[PDB]
Amino acid sequence: DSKPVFVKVPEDQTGLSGGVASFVCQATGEPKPRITWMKKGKKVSSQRFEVIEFDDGAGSVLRIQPLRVQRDEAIYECTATNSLGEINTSAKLSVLEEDQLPSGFPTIDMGPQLKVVEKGRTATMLCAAGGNPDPEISWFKDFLPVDPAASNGRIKQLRSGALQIESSEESDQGKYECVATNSAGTRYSAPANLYVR
């Protein structure tokens, strides 16, 4: 038995109105901890907010779409609890309009595209992003973070930013988004579908 400890901590984020923001929080414990979200001390409620669990509730994503500037700019808190202990961490969300978009805010130059792949074969979804400074890229599948490292080598994220999936299972099917992040803010690609066979 151990108290919860965070394995993924949500970072402060700056997003673009009409866009998407995801906060990810994950913890480990024994017993397995439960993740919970609050915006300003209140349980979250909207047509424009979704919470998606993973890791059997030990992982959680808060997804806001479309971002709306006055409403969504706030501090969001993740809490992880088990019988032994409670821990929390917070992150700030900022939403910019067009009018306020700094030069070098990331751009998706060529987003990923619909792809259909044979069961055996390998698929790579493409994100080519721009910005100053060069954005880091991450991927979400069906609203959830794709973690290449957890894959026992099957899935890799290339330096181009594309995602390479090999030995494609049926579990690979899903809508993939690429997020480009830099000091200016975060931008999502449109979703792209991967079907198997």
Residue 164: which CATH number? Answer: 2.60.40.10
The letter for the amino acid at 186 is: T
- Residues 58-88 as b/e (b if ≥16 CB within 10 A, e otherwise) read bbbbbbbbebeeeebeeebbbbbbbeeeebe
Same domain, 188 and 133: yes
Would the annotation count 63 as a binding residue? Answer: no
**What number of other Cβ atoms are within 10 A of residue 96's Cβ?**
19
Instruction: Note whether 92 and 186 are same-domain residues.
Output: no
Residues 89 and 28 in one domain: yes
Strands (E), 17-57: 21-30, 34-39, 42-43, 49-54
Alpha carbon 179 to its chain centroid, in Å, reads 8
39 is in an annotated binding site: yes
Regarding whether 103 and 68 lie in a shared domain, the answer is no
Q: Are residues 84 and 137 in the same domain?
A: no
Q: Are strands 155-157 and 144-145 parallel, antiparallel or unpaired?
A: unpaired
User: Where a domain ends, among 46, 65, 98?
Assistant: 98
Indicate whether 38 and 71 sit together in one domain: yes
Whole-number Å distance between alpha carbons of 24 and 44:
15
Please indicate if the annotation marks 3 as binding a ligand: no
Torsion of CA 160, 163, 165, 170, to 10 degrees: -160
104 with 189, same domain: the answer is yes
* Method used to obtain the model: X-ray
| CA angle, 161 then 89 then 143, to 5° | 40
105 shares a domain with 177: yes
The count of residues in the chain is 197
- Could you list the residue range(s) of the whole structural domain that residue 120 is in? 99-197
Question: CB within 8 A of 172, min separation 6: which ones?
Answer: 117, 123, 165, 194, 196
- Any binding-site annotation on 44? yes
Q: Which two tokens stand for residue 46?
A: 């909207």
Was 115 annotated as part of a binding site?
A: no
Q: What single letter denotes the amino acid at residue 106?
A: P
Distance between CA atoms of residues 106 and 93, nearest Å? 17
Q: Give me the number of domains the chain comprises.
A: 2
Q: Which H or E run contains 71? A: helix 69-72
Last residue in a domain, options 58, 73, 98: 98
- 43 annotated as ligand-binding: yes
If asked whether residues 6 and 70 sit together in one domain, one would say yes
59 belongs to an annotated ligand binding site: no
User: What Rg, from alpha-carbon coordinates, does the chain have?
Assistant: 17
> Which of 32, 41, 33, 27 lies closest to 77 in space, CA to CA?
41
Backbone angles phi, psi at 71, to 5 degrees: -70, -40
Within this chain, do residues 82 and 174 fall inside the same structural domain, yes or no? no
DSSP 153-180: SSEEE-TTS-EEE-S--GGG-EEEEEEE
Is residue 151 a known part of a binding site?
no
Q: Residue 146, SS3?
A: coil
Is 90 in the same domain as 117?
Answer: no
Do residues 135 and 196 share a domain?
A: yes
Domain boundary among 65, 98, 131: 98
